[PDB]
Design a protein around this ligand. Sequence first.
Ligand SMILES: Nc1nc2c(ncn2[C@@H]2O[C@H](COP(=O)(O)OP(=O)(O)OP(=O)(O)O)C[C@H]2O)c(=O)[nH]1
Ligand SMILES: Nc1nc2c(ncn2[C@@H]2O[C@H](COP(=O)(O)OP(=O)(O)OP(=O)(O)O)C[C@H]2O)c(=O)[nH]1
Ligand SMILES: [Mg+2]
Ligand SMILES: [Mg+2]
Ligand SMILES: [Mg+2]
Ligand SMILES: [Mg+2]
Ligand SMILES: [Mg+2]
Lengths: 293, 293
Amino acid sequence: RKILIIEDSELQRKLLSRWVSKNGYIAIEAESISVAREKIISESIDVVLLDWELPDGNGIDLISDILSTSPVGWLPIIMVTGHTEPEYFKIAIEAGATDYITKPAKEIELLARIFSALRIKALHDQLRETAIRDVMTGLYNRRYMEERIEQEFQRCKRHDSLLSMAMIDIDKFKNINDTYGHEIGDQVIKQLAHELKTSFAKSAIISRFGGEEFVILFPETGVVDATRILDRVRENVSKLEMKSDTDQIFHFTFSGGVAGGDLSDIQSNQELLKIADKNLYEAKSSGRNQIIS
Amino acid sequence: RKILIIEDSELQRKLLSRWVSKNGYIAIEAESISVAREKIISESIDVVLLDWELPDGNGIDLISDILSTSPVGWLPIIMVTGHTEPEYFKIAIEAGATDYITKPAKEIELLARIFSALRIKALHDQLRETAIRDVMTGLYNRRYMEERIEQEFQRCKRHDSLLSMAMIDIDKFKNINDTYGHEIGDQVIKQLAHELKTSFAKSAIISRFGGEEFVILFPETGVVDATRILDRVRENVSKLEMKSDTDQIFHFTFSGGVAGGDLSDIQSNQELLKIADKNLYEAKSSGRNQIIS
Ligand SMILES: Nc1nc2c(ncn2[C@@H]2O[C@H](COP(=O)(O)OP(=O)(O)OP(=O)(O)O)C[C@H]2O)c(=O)[nH]1
Ligand SMILES: Nc1nc2c(ncn2[C@@H]2O[C@H](COP(=O)(O)OP(=O)(O)OP(=O)(O)O)C[C@H]2O)c(=O)[nH]1
Ligand SMILES: [Mg+2]
Ligand SMILES: [Mg+2]
Ligand SMILES: [Mg+2]
Ligand SMILES: [Mg+2]
Ligand SMILES: [Mg+2]
């Protein structure tokens, strides 16, 4: 849907952008490398059209940086340059570009190569989601959340920016499987997953870390702010009326351990895990159905 | 690794083929639509180079058939044609083609667009493997085995070919977790996984279907032959000396339900599941540590 066009020439850039917007895409113009970096950071991009010679650098150098910013990890990049030498073609593709059009770009071909780029991007995005999300709940699975804590932790140390973590665990869940069966247990987990998915800010990262265990990172959020939010959700879950398959009404609760905030005195990300884990056991021994931070 | 090249012209085809094999790919040549059909059916292909005007029809008609032989339903297809009309470009891409070179093809561009196609394919295939594999055992998970039974069922019906299925479940495994802990339980599961991985042929498809449950497809194997194989594995498992965390020796066994063979009477793949499931319950009620078929 959203396409970023990096070209120094006014005439060429306004032309390309008219063509692309005309077929129902959103066009994002960038007159320079400097303005391109600004647009990548600030807007989710599906395809890039990339000039080679910009007034403030070379497209090749920007390819690397685009792929490492991409929140999904791969993005189709199509070169649109005056450079016609086959050596320049091989270099761009090897640098990470997907396609390469020599100027002047022709409208029919351009829109068809964008079609082909977005088709592959759509398949990639689906394959990615099935690899990193848990099948039953559609939350992030463990093997991916581990990598994302690491990469999210480092990111917030190499910046003066807060990062709170919650670890939650369903109260007396083995008792629920024994009373109402595995199949009702599965439904309770699915219901909690759906409440977590819809209750937090869009930046919050939610994982199904174990059978009945969940971990949530809150970027740019203090420990106190994360705790009030998670305590509203815990209140909401406690007042849900669940039905068994024999029309028995029942409630469930979860316990929470919160950690992080100011990360100054926390050295590795695994120290963040253990503070949250210690707090969750605090919550379990302190009467359950509560958050501790 | 394997590239299919469909071109009517011997000079062009042997040239393209030399270029591709030169960069460490295997080249499969096809002089005509007729010979291409026979190569697609008989060899798994990573990329196709596709001429449009063949003596016995049009490449575009072949695109659809190529995409449906991919087990996930998508393959990089690069048009390499004399056709320079924008309508031929738009229709090839819309038909399913990924890329399009106008003749005369240059070696550098050709191999760089192949690189681009195979780079995407390699990332997709890795994302796929992480989505279909269970982390603990490294076997196929449930969501994938369900789809693969369907795929293998239909494919064994569209041939006069046998297909046996086993369903197994560990005997008194809750007792093993309760006596020796969750972590010894995890090792017992892993031990069974290792026995399955090393006991069956190359052709066997092995899945972790539940916590402690496994299903195995045996292509071109009778029910009687699948039963002795799974019974030799059951004998091997029963004679393993397992250690607790306090150097206590113990044995574990599984019960087996086998199904399928001649597929003539069998209507859907779900019927295969239930016959195996029924047999496994028979095996559990009959004294456990045994196979029933
Ligand atoms: N239905 C269902 N049950 C599960 C699943 N995964 C684990 N369980 C069950 O939930 C149990 C959770 O164990 P615990 O951490 O001991 O929690 P608990 O026994 O409920 O008690 P508490 O959390 O309050 O300590 C373990 C397992 O028996 C699942 O995917 N589905
Ligand atoms: N350690 C471990 N235990 C698991 C895992 N997944 C499930 N379990 C446990 O295994 C239990 C198996 O129970 P059942 O399938 O009823 O079989 P069983 O109790 O072994 O008895 P039987 O098949 O002989 O009737 C369910 C759960 O307690 C796992 O991943 N690891
Ligand atoms: Mg320029
Ligand atoms: Mg619990
Ligand atoms: Mg737990
Ligand atoms: Mg069992
Ligand atoms: Mg079982």
